[PDB]
Amino acid sequence: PGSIPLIGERFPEMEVTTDHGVIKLPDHYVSQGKWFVLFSHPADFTPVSTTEFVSFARRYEDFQRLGVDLIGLSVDSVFSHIKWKEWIERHIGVRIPFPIIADPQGTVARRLGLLHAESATHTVRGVFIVDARGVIRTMLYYPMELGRLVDEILRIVKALKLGDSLKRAVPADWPNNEIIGEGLIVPPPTTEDQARARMESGQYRSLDWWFSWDTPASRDDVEEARRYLRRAAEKPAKLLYEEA
Amino acid sequence: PGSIPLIGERFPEMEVTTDHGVIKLPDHYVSQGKWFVLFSHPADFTPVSTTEFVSFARRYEDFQRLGVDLIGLSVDSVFSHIKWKEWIERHIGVRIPFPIIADPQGTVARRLGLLHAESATHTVRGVFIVDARGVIRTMLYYPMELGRLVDEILRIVKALKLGDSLKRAVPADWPNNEIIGEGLIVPPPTTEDQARARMESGQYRSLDWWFSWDTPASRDDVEEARRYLRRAAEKPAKLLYEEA
Amino acid sequence: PGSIPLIGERFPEMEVTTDHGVIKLPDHYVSQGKWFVLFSHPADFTPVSTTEFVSFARRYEDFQRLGVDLIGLSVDSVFSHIKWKEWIERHIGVRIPFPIIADPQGTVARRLGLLHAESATHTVRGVFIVDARGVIRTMLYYPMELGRLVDEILRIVKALKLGDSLKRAVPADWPNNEIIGEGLIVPPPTTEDQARARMESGQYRSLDWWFSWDTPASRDDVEEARRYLRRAAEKPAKLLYEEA
Amino acid sequence: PGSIPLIGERFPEMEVTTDHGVIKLPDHYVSQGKWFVLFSHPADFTPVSTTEFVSFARRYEDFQRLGVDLIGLSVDSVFSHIKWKEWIERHIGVRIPFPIIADPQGTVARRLGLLHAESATHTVRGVFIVDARGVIRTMLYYPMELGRLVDEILRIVKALKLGDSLKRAVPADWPNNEIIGEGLIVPPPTTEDQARARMESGQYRSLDWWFSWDTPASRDDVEEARRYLRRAAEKPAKLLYEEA
Amino acid sequence: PGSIPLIGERFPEMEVTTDHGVIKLPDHYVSQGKWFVLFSHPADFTPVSTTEFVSFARRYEDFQRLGVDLIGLSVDSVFSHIKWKEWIERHIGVRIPFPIIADPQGTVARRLGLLHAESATHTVRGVFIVDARGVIRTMLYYPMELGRLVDEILRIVKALKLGDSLKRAVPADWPNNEIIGEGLIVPPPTTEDQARARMESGQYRSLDWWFSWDTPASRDDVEEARRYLRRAAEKPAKLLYEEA
Amino acid sequence: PGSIPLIGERFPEMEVTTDHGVIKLPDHYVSQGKWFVLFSHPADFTPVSTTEFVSFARRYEDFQRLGVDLIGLSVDSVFSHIKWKEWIERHIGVRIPFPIIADPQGTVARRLGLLHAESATHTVRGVFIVDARGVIRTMLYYPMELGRLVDEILRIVKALKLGDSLKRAVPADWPNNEIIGEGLIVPPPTTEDQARARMESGQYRSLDWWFSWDTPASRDDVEEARRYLRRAAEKPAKLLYEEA
Amino acid sequence: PGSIPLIGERFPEMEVTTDHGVIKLPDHYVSQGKWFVLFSHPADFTPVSTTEFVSFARRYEDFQRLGVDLIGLSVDSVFSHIKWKEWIERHIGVRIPFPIIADPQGTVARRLGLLHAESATHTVRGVFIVDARGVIRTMLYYPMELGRLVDEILRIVKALKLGDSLKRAVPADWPNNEIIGEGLIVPPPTTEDQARARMESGQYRSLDWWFSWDTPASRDDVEEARRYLRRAAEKPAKLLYEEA
Amino acid sequence: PGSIPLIGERFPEMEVTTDHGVIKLPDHYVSQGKWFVLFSHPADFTPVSTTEFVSFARRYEDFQRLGVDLIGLSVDSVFSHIKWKEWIERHIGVRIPFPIIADPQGTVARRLGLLHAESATHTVRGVFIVDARGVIRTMLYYPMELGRLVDEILRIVKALKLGDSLKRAVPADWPNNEIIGEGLIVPPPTTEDQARARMESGQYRSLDWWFSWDTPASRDDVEEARRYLRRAAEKPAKLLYEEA
Question: Which of B38, C223, D178, D222 has the fewest CB atoms within 10 Å, counting from its CB?
């Protein structure tokens, strides 16, 4: 087994070397009021990893609009990072705008539990979603053989920001939940008095005292979330390998 | 932080009490040649949890067609599991067909790293995708306030089964990858002799010796994966709260 | 196997989550000048546990008369506690007025020694009788298969309060002791001088210098205690399962 | 705090000196098919203790008819035990027929967790109810100042033996339960299939799938248990101190 | 083996419960200006122990004449102590005037090394002779099967007080020593200059520079010591069993 | 404090150097069917020690008649032992017939607990009475300033041998006990059935079921023990210094 | 092996009991500006040891004229020391003027590493030569079977004092060294510059830069040292055993 | 503050590198039936050390006559040993015939305790006298500033060999002892029987039972030992620095 940071913990304090320079996590992004998604890949010049870097780069403006910065990680050196990003820009025609952590002794990898049994030497495809207070909100661990669905990372951050600002919980498959649609859930009562007051208020649609909801998300917020999933579901019009 | 089992490890050997009786993991599923998805939720009679059970139940036949069984997990007793499943069938009209582990002292939760900093007493929304050899393939940790995207769990399993059977890696956002579309990736060469053989062979479309792909998935395999994402993306026609 | 708190010790300081909110023990009750009876049960929606909750609720006014508050405990969540108390009120017609502690990781159970060999996961039927100074006065440990005799819990508190106010020890089976009836015992001399002064004072009825008693309890206090045992011994006039 | 043996554990193996000779617990009783009640008291020639010995002696044939032996315990020596028992027979006219363990260094007291905070040197009024397999079934801890209700100890053993024999759980305040009277509880279903089958069966009176009961106890078993409580509730016509 | 306090150490600081009350040793006796003899016996209501309590009681005035207080010790409780002393006074006609320590968990016994291999649970027949400064002067350990010679304890105290008051050592069998009779010994020189001064002096009777003596004890001091031995050697005029 | 060997323990196995040669304890004496008295003294050429050696030597035939050998012990060398014994024979006219252990590093002294706080470097006047099984039966610790009463050591051995042979315990001050005289005590019953058999038998004089005695010792055995005490009590006819 | 003090270390601080009284080492001698020779012998009343004490005593004035005090040591008591020194003065006609340490528990012996494998309990024949600063300058360890050559101890102290005063090293067999006779050695150069300056100066007789000497000792100092060696070499004119 | 091997212990088993080759101690010499003298010096090319090597070399035939081999030791390498020996032969005209141990890491120095406080880096002038059984018989520790008296080493070996062959102890200053001259001491009696057997037999000259001697050494053995001391005491006829 191995050790990982946990949801609701502060992201571990660390100085990291990137191909943009040395930065302190999470302070670099907390300072700017930004969320960040830290994601790892096994090695530079690997093909699944390349497809994921191009996916993130294509969604860069969507991440930026949520106040989310992106930061990559692998055990490769900064020189490899710069050569690999140059290769992607020259051969796929896509600039990778975000920094990649160089972690050659796996110091960061070990701290974040990114070395699994699949490889003794390369990180799996981990994802840490970290809010502007530097708190870990979600963690995903995809394996070497499977690329991420990057639109689900956008949907997670959009839904978490909506929940934080509207004081709501977010149903399964939001904004297309089969029970309440684009509805958001009122956190359930935790006392007998809160439960009776909830039933007696009539202020929310409810199935029981513990299951109440309303529709407080803006049309634009729901449409932005729906766009991420529509993009995930769409057969591409053009394939980038066809351009060059 | 907290300890977790790891991708490529055998799922920890354990006897668990469910609302279907006592079973041994992973043996119960290994014996049937089935994959399983073990997922956790904080407490019975909680609303996001309820929406996720209904989503899984709706997708049950999709999981069964892949040869994937489902098993849930809460700190609640089997008596609460049975009363909550009865509630969902009576009030939402959806039978939950799969078992739920009862884990009152968090014995199972501690072994799977399901107790994070967000709650001292309730599991987060963990997902363990386990193959027919009992090997952990993917792990997701969603928080209390955010329901899962269950169609991404179907995509993961379908894509891992396709990678396993065709000996291919799966690009970002498959089957809608922006570079190669529904193409699957040939694992890169790891030696100079292999790199030269790849580049002289003419066998595969390639961008470089380390980035080769082909289109070995069937129309039916690709359409099955695209249907999961199209479902995720569709505004529901009818809401189940409307016929509660 | 199993540490427990002990008679004569202050009840261990703890913050507990109930279906009435968070309360500090024993301070919540000490601050009010109230005794409390903390009792546990294995799981909500279990039948022996339901019979005991109804027994305590039916005796609620007798506990109130003695200045005693009641507080339950099980490993189930507050959501299951609220749904189970709702079920009792709806199907048995008896409102459960007192709080239940939610103890899902057995944090409280472990501190009170309520996890025995009979179940790894569920508390036995423990009783802690705690006075208005926060001192543990009596502890009972009943098993899963046997309900408690709630009238003996009332007799204990009543006798302990009488002992405390009158400076007396209480004989077996009080107030129907076969030697001294409703008599209360003078704590025995612990010195030769004390023993002779006792034997010469003719102040008490005696069988020996170590066995003196008088009858200082009011007829009301005696009959109140006897009423608890008379109720325990009576066949119910009508069974609540009929008028349900 | 302090350590105790637990319900469902074998009574700790030990050789003990009594005023009947040296015996091995729990073997001495297991080998006869007998339950035993081991109870403690602080010291010989103390008045509450004497009332409890007389109460147990008065109920000796009731225990014997149930197949239950009695054994006492204090830190006094065997010579004091024999003198104290002689005193009770001569001054109260009640022979104490059962053995008392002599525990002068408190070896047994520490093993059984009978030294609480009320006294560093003398056991509280502990009770261990041990079945014929040598398993602890119930534990009570009464304090120095309060005599036990010996009829509740008979009710417990009677109710556990009925529950063992009939494969039933025993409601609160049996045989005068306010919901089901002398009814005994069918252990609840622990699976969905068991819950449905119970509800379809028509075999038992039910309030829900988890709350079924029948009336399988013999009229004699019910009348005996009611007789113990009637005796607890009734004022003796004659006090033994008057015929001293 | 076992640990003991040693000759020339202050008696261990200790609060003890006796049948006269709670007292601090050795402080209680140091404050009275008194030596004490602490002696132990295995258990109350034992025959050799009873003979020794009667022997000490008969010599009480001889201990008072030397400024010595007596204090007994066994593992029995204070109630047993008072009953046993009551038995001795009623059946043998001798009042026991001095206190007995009750030591039920062997706290005092373990500190004084009075638990030997002959019994795991009862003290042997230890004697600690403690002077008016609280210092241990002599220790005797008799076994269960052999009563002490109480006149030798009187001889030890008398001789130690004579040695202290006269700066003399006391020969074997004093005051009937076969070499020097009632003579007392001058502490030997420890330096060549002291040895020369001693041989040049003519002050004492001498067999060598290391063996000098004189007769500084009063005739009263000598004859009092001789009387203890003469009593030890005399056939009793009348046996107390005869006048029972 | 310091550790000591204990009554009922085998005398610790040790090879010792004496002025008679090297021997093993307790084997040397056990092999001959002998008891032994090991006694210690602070140093050779000290006057109280010299008086004790002469007293033991005067009694040596009394020890031999009992099957008891003597063995001394001090931290001085064998050369000092031989010179000192020669001095005693030449100046006092008494041959010391028994061996003395030489213990210069205090190996033996530390094993027997003979270094007390009175002296860091010299043994106190310890006495170990060891039976022919090699078992310690009594231990005495006299201080530097006070010679032993050697007749009490003969009385101990004689009484222990009589009690062992006759299966009797020995009263205080035997054979002049004030209650029973030259009576010996029947060990007390330890069970209710033995106590009844004793008080139904009529076979012994008794004060109670726990205090029975008879007179099984021979007139010669009683007269021999009284002779030791009469010798202790009588002023010697002639002092050895008067021809020294 | 065993631990010893080392040349160049301060003699260990210790209070010791001698036949002259208690003294602190090395302070007692350091205080007077005196060297001391501490020497040990196995035991008093041993013959090689007696010859050595007579040898030291014969040389006492030679040590006093160098400002060297003598102090002996054995595991015997001070009483044996005084009796043995008396024996020497009376039988040999030689007074032993210097103190002997009494070390009965071997505390000092163990501190100076004087217990070797030849004897578990008696010190070998050690010699500690200690200067007026309290520093150990030379250590000799002679065995039980071989007396020391006391004139070599004089030679060592005379040679060390001359070396210290004149800032010289002392050749083998000084003052009869076969290379330089009564010559004293100039400490060699330890640097290249020092070695060249030594050879360029022509201040001393030299065999090489590392081997220079001169003759700075007075005729009196040289004759004093040769006299010690002459005495060692010459058969005494008269043997002390004769004039007994 | 340093460990050394001890008299009567076997010389520590070790392989050492010498300027004659690798040899095992003490086996190399034991195998030949030879004693050896192992001696230490601080460093090669030091002047006191050179005087000692020349002294040993001049006495080499005397050591050979006694069956004693010589072995030196310093922390310098074998190359420095050979150059230094070459220097002594060329500049002093004396061949060093015996080996020197090279001990550059102080491995041998540390085993033999030859590193004292005078130097962290160089051995003091240690001497180990080792018999033909490999047993350490004597140890000398001379300091850096003082050469040894080699004739005393010859006298020790000659005297130990005489003692071993004649079963005698050797008096102080032998063969010029002031009491007994060239007499040798009979080991003292260690038992009373031996002491009486010695004083009855009149086979030896005696001052007491513990001081007997005879003259068993041949005149050759006595005069050979006296010759060593006479050589120590003589001014050299010719100083070696003269011719050099």
Answer: C223
